[PDB]
Design a binder for this molecule. Structure first.
Ligand SMILES: [Ca+2]
Ligand SMILES: [Ca+2]
Ligand SMILES: [Ca+2]
Ligand SMILES: [Ca+2]
Ligand SMILES: [Ca+2]
Ligand SMILES: [Ca+2]
Lengths: 222, 199, 222, 199, 199, 199
């Protein structure tokens, strides 16, 4: 049994998220969770969207808690994708990382393909990743559509917690004031398409482990 | 890497493809100029080079209903003739075929995992032992071309081998995009030169 | 778990051919290889094509080497098929053997069905055969679309190597001069169809083991 | 100290304070320019620097009947907002309070004894691990200021942290002097520059 | 080391100098872009990096009869002022100087020869340990430029240091070509990006 | 080693140079024929060879008062362009340079003296490891010439590398004799042929 596939018509995956895990050592607090991040859809043409890997931006929950603390450090951050359409849908996905907040985004798949977590897959694929979201014991991720921060090669040792707006304002002065506020931005591409009008494909989840560190009341944190 | 030598490894799409009603046979030289665009812009500032490892892999991007196949193989004496048929192509060093929608077990090569399953990776990797020249000069497509144009036998010292990709399969007379071919190399960069000066 | 199938949408198979194997005893040389033989496509209607099981005709490589020797003997020859279209494509395949070079080809499936390796299958099937091509260790070929010479019931003990043209010329004199030059011809049928215009289906491979025997320079062999 | 690096330790009053009827919240950057006057005049002839250790301590100087309290804590992203209340301040890294007349068990830190009793030293010391930059440039108050004035986020690379001192307590609407805050540091002086040239 | 990490070492021309009657002070940012046009073309292909080593050497091109001296020192606060006098410059970090005709005992750093004489060699290597940032991003002059002009403190985020070179000598108030400055580095390249997209 | 294989080591004059006001760039093929007239007369007696070692050194002949500098770097694609600027040339393989009056610390390579100072020495040795071809045949200029003019890529078969030398300096737009270039090689001669028959 080798070199023999069986093309399904649909990949089913049932996500049942696990409760957040929080645990405090003396001054550091460690949080590990996973929330859903974005929903994706394909078009006849390329489409590059992008995301800040900062805690406010990563999760709806995250932001609300992580905000009670002055500066964090990522320990792990994973973007993993999961399909919703049948294996008949046309179009693939691509993601990779970028780091100088002043760099323009790629416009070509060609381009996109040399970034740090370059990963790509037909839009109907992705169910291998499931354990990462569920966080189960992974089977064989050979084929998953995951991307993970290169946590150890970030520029700052720690980063302050920033609110979107504070960020923005800053960035607006000079885009690379930004280069402190965030360690990296994730880049997404949806090409391959069939409809000129968007077809919804999959959705992707974030899974992190962050160090929290110098308590502040939320109201004062920007 | 030494203070003389540079070792570089990387991934990239070397090329994009589609299938038709009928057969179409392409060929791409296994020269850093043509392998991808980055390798090009990088390799470019080195005069000679040597392939430590080089591999082409495919990754499906179409629907499970796209009908068709890919076939890759290698030629090594540029005087030789591109196979006409698939037939001839199934006899080359490294022959491989697969339905245009399969191939994502290969994603680990673009990745770097340890493909447990290489059993269904549509990939192809060069027999670097059997290469004819210890090292190769960095040619530009043009120079190369012009050069050949004189007497193909000259390409024999300009390059290790040529990859032959066949795309037979189809439903439309209209090319349907099926996948993409990515390159994975570990080049041995060798005696600097200023880009501008290279041919 | 019995009497329960799961209809895939596509059968995937990755062929990665093995290097030719040559090994010389004193005067006999033995060659074992596999090359691709033909590509098949279906039509709204029946279509009988046919092939000579002689070495020139069997492979593009074969012919070039086998030609350096005066007469051979088959030890094994297998025709195995592999799908390319989705399990939605209509039309099946049929193959069988014929032996008096003067016999007209069948025109009916009915007809076709009583030949020596009668084998048939929907055009989307075939991935069981894979080991034969790859030559792997076969799993369960119950359902493969293979056909193999009945090597031991051929008419001549050995056959001379013939060039197509020499053959032809001969055949043209009297079709059954032919009866020496080749031990048998394979017959192919593609019916079932849907389009009036040809739809490409699968392709088939040959896998042989031949005895080579009384060296001659190629230039002199016809 | 190396022939490249200089290590310097010292003590100094970083600042003097009083209390009133009501609350008053000050802040002082934990930058050698602002920590004391000597550190200033010394550090000044170095371009970069790094805090090996830094600590603020208080020493009472009023009568056992002066009524009031001191509260110190640390902030680290200059975009953040000085706590309005004490309340907010009791939640910062390093929070500490004590009656304005207590605190002389801390004298050992200005001294260098080995405070057996750190149990009632009104002191506060920086979490140098958790600092964001490996090293810090020597900013002058001005430059710093002007810089911030553009987009506070920039202060984030100009400094490790800001100390927040709250003085609530009182009897007079008239500030009554209660104590003094001294600094104890072990600075890592780093790549000379001529004073005059520094900002 | 070569994974996702690329290391390379090179040596090239950073710039040329000439002397006048008076004193002229220049500065070079020590970033991959501005160090040389080679590195520049190679480094653009990667997102961020860190200097493992870098160093400037000056090589005479004159007769023994020219009149001047080169000087150089590193500076690290994109915000401080350039020296304005030899003396000032005198206490920068690699302070080094000599007559515009001396220096030959420096081929070696260029050359990549092991030569037990640094006896004298107008060479200055960076203190690649005490850089503010773990790593730095690839910044392209024009951007840098732009940013630095918002506030001359942002650059501090973008570059590990700046070389100061003063040409004082003077025979003529005309400019005399005296030699050149060469950079010798070992850089560690890291998050590949399409060249074209790197500001 | 001496069987059917012959090894010999020698040292001679490869060529002489002079400086002008402007920049002049030359090139020398580094083959036995063109390296010197001695080797040339010795090597013709053998069919093919390989460089075990070869290297060019420059020796001053002027007063300390001349004005110019020699430069040199190796190139390996008989098809690429000669540098056109110091900078360009600056990142060739043995980049080395100095004032036309410096260099004496090079007798040694000529001399065959063990001398712990290469301190400075305008010397460039070939990277005799990274040559394209295992061995090379004896080619006689005029032939080489001829061939290279068919396509400037055939030479790549015939020679391991080319020295580039640029004389930039300039006092006068007249030519000034400044010194000479000397080659020091160790060649391995191999399939004896009547001299007269070797093109
Ligand atoms: Ca904040
Ligand atoms: Ca070249
Ligand atoms: Ca015959
Ligand atoms: Ca400063
Ligand atoms: Ca950049
Ligand atoms: Ca010859």
């Amino acid at each position: 049994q080798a070199g023999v596939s069986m093309a399904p018509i649909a990949q089913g995956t049932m996500v049942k998220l696990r409760p957040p895990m929080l645990r405090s050592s003396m001054d550091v607090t460690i949080l590990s969770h996973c929330e859903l991040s974005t929903e994706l859809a394909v078009t006849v043409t390329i489409v590059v969207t992008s995301e800040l890997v900062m805690p406010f931006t990563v999760g709806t929950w995250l932001r609300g808690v992580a905000q009670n603390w002055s500066k964090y450090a990522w320990v792990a951050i994973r973007y993993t994708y999961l399909p919703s359409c049948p294996t008949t849908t046309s179009g693939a996905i691509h993601m990779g990382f970028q780091y100088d907040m002043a760099d323009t985004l790629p416009v070509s798949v060609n381009q996109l393909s040399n970034l740090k977590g370059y990963v790509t897959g037909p839009v109907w694929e992705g169910q291998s990743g499931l354990c990462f979201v569920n966080n189960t014991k992974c089977p064989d991720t050979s084929r998953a559509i995951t991307i993970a921060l290169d946590t150890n090669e970030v520029s700052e040792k720690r980063y302050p917690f920033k609110t979107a707006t504070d960020y923005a304002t800053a960035v607006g002065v000079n885009a690379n004031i930004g280069n402190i506020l965030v360690p990296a931005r994730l880049v997404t591409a949806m090409e391959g398409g069939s409809s000129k009008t968007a077809v919804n494909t999959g959705r992707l989840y974030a899974s992190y482990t962050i160090r929290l560190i110098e308590p502040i009341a939320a109201a004062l944190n920007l």
